[PDB]
């Protein structure tokens, strides 16, 4: 789900 991508980005930053 494209709408979950930024969540992954947030967690790894």
């Amino acid at each position, epitope marked *: *789900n*494209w*709408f*979950d*991508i*930024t*969540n992954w*980005l*947030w*967690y790894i*930053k």
Partner: antibody, heavy 126, light 109 residues
């Protein structure tokens, strides 16, 4: 977070329109920006979006082939291009960015659209 | 494509009354990624609920969201004058996000 869109435009049938959305506040590159339109007296329709940092676009199938969404990190500006315009494309176009959890604007992203531009009326007409 | 059905499309209610608005999805909504927005004439939409039941800090606590799978509800505990408006549901549990057609809450008289 403030999203400010370019002004109303009248466009001929068959032409292409570009609408801009300049963001200030929060973080531009790692939050998802979408475009949503609303034809007069009608409902909201999600068209597509972009995540600037990765350059990852996501288009509704209905607009896949007619739309290009781009993001310029150096100005925090996103762009909607819609081609082959027809009268049924007459609408208010809104950019919308996802929200973040908690106070402030560097929190965990929520997907749903907390921040909306003022809208840009595009009128397709001869 | 997930079709979101908001029925009835209009509700005539009185100030002070409770309102419950239905959003039914044609297929299960992934991770309950279901949002509700309000829109007044001449204005951009505004987010009320995300993730089916989470409410952003600024949004009045008379709005609540519930449900899961295909059966979602926005509840307005007590209608204030400013709550008479249009309400849209939206799913974003897959890359193709979709909106319902909206329910107008209007003043019965």
């Amino acid at each position: 977070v403030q999203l400010v869109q370019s002004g109303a435009e009248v466009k001929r049938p068959g032409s292409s329109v570009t609408v801009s959305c300049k963001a200030s506040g929060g973080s531009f590159s790692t939050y998802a920006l979408s475009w949503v339109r609303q034809a007069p007296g009608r409902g909201l329709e999600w068209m597509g979006g972009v995540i600037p940092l990765l350059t990852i676009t996501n288009y509704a199938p209905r607009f896949q082939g007619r739309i290009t969404i781009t993001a310029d990190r150096s100005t925090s500006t996103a762009y909607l291009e819609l081609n082959s315009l027809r009268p049924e494309d007459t609408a208010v176009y809104y950019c919308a960015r996802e929200g973040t959890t908690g106070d402030g604007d560097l929190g965990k992203p929520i997907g749903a659209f907390a921040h909306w531009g003022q809208g840009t009326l595009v009128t397709v007409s001869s | 494509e997930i079709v979101l059905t908001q029925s009835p499309g209009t509700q005539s209610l009185s100030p002070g009354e409770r309102a419950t608005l239905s959003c039914r999805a044609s297929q299960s909504v992934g991770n309950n990624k279901l949002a509700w927005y309000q829109q007044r004439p001449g204005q951009a939409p505004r987010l009320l609920i995300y993730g089916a039941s989470s409410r952003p800090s600024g949004v009045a606590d008379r709005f609540s969201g519930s449900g899961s799978g295909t059966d979602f509800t926005l509840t307005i505990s007590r209608l204030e004058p400013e709550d008479f408006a249009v309400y849209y549901c939206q799913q974003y549990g897959q890359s193709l996000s979709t909106f319902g057609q909206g329910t107008k809450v209007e003043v019965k008289r």
